[PDB]
Amino acid sequence: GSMKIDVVTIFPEYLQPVRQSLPGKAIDAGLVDVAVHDLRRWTHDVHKSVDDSPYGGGPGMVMKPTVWGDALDEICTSETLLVVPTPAGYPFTQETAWQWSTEDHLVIACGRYEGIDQRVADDAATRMRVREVSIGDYVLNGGEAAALVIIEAVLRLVPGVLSLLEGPSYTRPPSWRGMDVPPVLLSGDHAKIAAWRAEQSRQRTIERRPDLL
Amino acid sequence: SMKIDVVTIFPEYLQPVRQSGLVDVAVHDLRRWTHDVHKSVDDSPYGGGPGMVMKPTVWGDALDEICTSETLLVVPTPAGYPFTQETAWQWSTEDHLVIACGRYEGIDQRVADDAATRMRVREVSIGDYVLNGGEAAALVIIEAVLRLVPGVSLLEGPSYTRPPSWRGMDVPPVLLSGDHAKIAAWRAEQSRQRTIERRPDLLGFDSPT
Ligand SMILES: COc1ccc2nc(C(=O)O)sc2c1
Numbered sequence: 355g356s357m358k359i360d361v362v363t364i365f366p367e368y369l370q371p372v373r374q375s376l377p378g379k380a381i382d383a384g385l386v387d388v389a390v391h392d393l394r395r396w397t398h399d400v401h402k403s404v405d406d407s408p409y410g411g412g413p414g415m416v417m418k419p420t421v422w423g424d425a426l427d428e429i430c431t432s433e434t435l436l437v438v439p440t441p442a443g444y445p446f447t448q449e450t451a452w453q454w455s456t457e458d459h460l461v462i463a464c465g466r467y468e469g470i471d472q473r474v475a476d477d478a479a480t481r482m483r484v485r486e487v488s489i490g491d492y493v494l495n496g497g498e499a500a501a502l503v504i505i506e507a508v509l510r511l512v513p514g515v516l517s518l519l520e521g522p523s524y525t526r527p528p529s530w531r532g533m534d535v536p537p538v539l540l541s542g543d544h545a546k547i548a549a550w551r552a553e554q555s556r557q558r559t560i561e562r563r564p565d566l567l
Numbered sequence: 568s569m570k571i572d573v574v575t576i577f578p579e580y581l582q583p584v585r586q587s588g589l590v591d592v593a594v595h596d597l598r599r600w601t602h603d604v605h606k607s608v609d610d611s612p613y614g615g616g617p618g619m620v621m622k623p624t625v626w627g628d629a630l631d632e633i634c635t636s637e638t639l640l641v642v643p644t645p646a647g648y649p650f651t652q653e654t655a656w657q658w659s660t661e662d663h664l665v666i667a668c669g670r671y672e673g674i675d676q677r678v679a680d681d682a683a684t685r686m687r688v689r690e691v692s693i694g695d696y697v698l699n700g701g702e703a704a705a706l707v708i709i710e711a712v713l714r715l716v717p718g719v720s721l722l723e724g725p726s727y728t729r730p731p732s733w734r735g736m737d738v739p740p741v742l743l744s745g746d747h748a749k750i751a752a753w754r755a756e757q758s759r760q761r762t763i764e765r766r767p768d769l770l771g772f773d774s775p776t
């Protein structure tokens with residue numbers, strides 16, 4: 355398909371390598387376009403302020419609603435899927451990536467400090483689809499690394515752009531530092547090979563991810 | 568003091584680390600440890616299957632030079648143990664992390680097996696989705712760990728700042744009241760509501776759908 359992704363951030367250089375990692379063939383065929391925008395373009399003052407103190411007290415700072423509102427007004431339309439990475443979000447999974455892979459337009463809003471004033475997402479949700487998501491149970495400094503992960507996971511599911519656990523894999527040489535490749539893999543018995551791989555998958559899932567069982 | 572070494576066939580993809588003397592980060596091109604003209608690092612899998620596997624020989628030579636017996640070797644993979652906030656706290660007091668980034672369908676299993684005979688090894692997943700390689704996972708792990716380095720339950724609720732009315736939407740009036748007890752209670756109730764709706768697993772309830 356043809357997908358446009360806009361990313362808004364106070365650290366636009368963070369996103370530049372993924373921009374360049376796009377294959378020319380996909381860009382030239384108009385299959386994908388990733389654009390990155392400096393949030394400070396929409397600030398109101400000579401000091402280019404994007405943050406302010408939290409109502410109700412507490413540590414850190416909160417990103418200003420007036421700046422974010424102006425940025426999203428310009429970039430989003432009614433057809434936009436607005437993605438807001440946050441530790442308090444719904445889980446982003448492979449199922450999510452498959453769903454988003456058929457979208458015409460994703461906009462990813464990257465927070466810093468303690469996050470974005472909640473009225474920004476609440477206002478946007480009255481005229482477009484909004485999704486607050488987390489990429490895992492750890493705390494980052496901001497949304498930029500989450501945006502990188504989401505872009506990679508989604509775009510590899512777009513044609514021509516980019517349960518049990520998988521078991522161990524092997525290639526040449528057949529013997530290395532005293533360790534031989536499991537002989538069953540060189541046996542030419544492909545039903546037996548499939549059964550061996552299934553059992554390796556079972557054992558690894560029990561050991562590393564008992565939640566999946 | 569922490570040293571982090573990252574090994575990858577795409578060193579350019581790690582440039583965003585430059586977010587910043589208590590920690591040093593270095594990035595290495597895996598292909599520098601090859602000896603042939605085509606600099607090949609991959610071949611077809613034994614036993615069949617799609618795609619290619621990274622050869623153990625080149626990885627062995629790279630890690631021989633970079634690692635010591637005190638190194639914690641980190642290998643991002645979808646088949647890993649989960650990387651969580653607990654993991655980040657644990658790794659925050661390490662002297663030396665080495666992060667090995669896979670491409671293609673992954674790395675020959677004997678690389679981790681051989682390394683484990685001389686150092687501690689951790690295969691980890693940063694979440695249940697598929698990347699094209701280990702590089703983005705390395706960036707996530709580095710950011711989560713470095714913010715906990717000495718000298719550097721429930722979901723968080725919503726945050727607000729000025730102005731107190733915007734586009735006809737009000738900041739919750741309790742937050743303007745100056746009543747610490749009432750503010751703490753409201754914030755606790757917002758967090759409860761959020762966790763039940765979005766992450767019921769954190770409170771010991773079934774996950775949706
Ligand atoms: C302030 O912006 C943030 C901070 C932490 C954070 N952590 C995420 C995660 O997905 O784990 S997204 C995100 C956004």
Ligand SMILES: COc1ccc2nc(C(=O)O)sc2c1
Nearest residue numbers: 643644669692693698700701
């Ligand atoms: C081939 O190297 C890969 C590929 C996908 C992948 N996915 C990860 C994740 O943690 O979800 S780590 C990782 C490494």
